[model samples]
Target: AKVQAYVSDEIVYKINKIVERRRAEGAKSTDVSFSSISTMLLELGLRVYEAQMER
Candidate 1:
């Protein structure tokens, strides 16, 4: 099934907020490591995706 634009935008917005908060708290660019971010993001994305899938 196709993903909705709003859902994609919401994901980007939420993830950006999380990353921005980390940056504001002095998380170095490198310290904002992809592995860590992706891990967190995957958890969030999985939940969001599951919800959307249910719709």
Candidate 2:
């Protein structure tokens, strides 16, 4: 299986920053601002970094 999400747009990157900030601030009680997609993206990013480091 494979998944790819290209984040080339400026707004998309900016929105990700906002999402990251909200998650870093604290857990939300009502809506739960922490998103599973965001978590997956973060973990995937780290995995990519690790993969690169192994090269």
For lDDT, the strongest prediction is 1
Candidate 1 TM-score over all chains jointly: 0.44
Model 1 lowest lDDT segment of ten: 5-14
Q: For residues 1-55, what per-residue lDDT tens digits would candidate 2 score against the true structure?
A: 3358654533344335545665688847555333543555565655553353254
TM-scores of the candidates are 0.44, 0.34
Q: Report RMSD for candidate 1.
A: 7.1
Worst lDDT window (10 residues) for model 2? 6-15
Instruction: Please give the CA lDDT of all the candidate structures.
Output: 0.59, 0.50
The whole-model C-alpha lDDT of candidate 2 against the native structure comes to 0.50
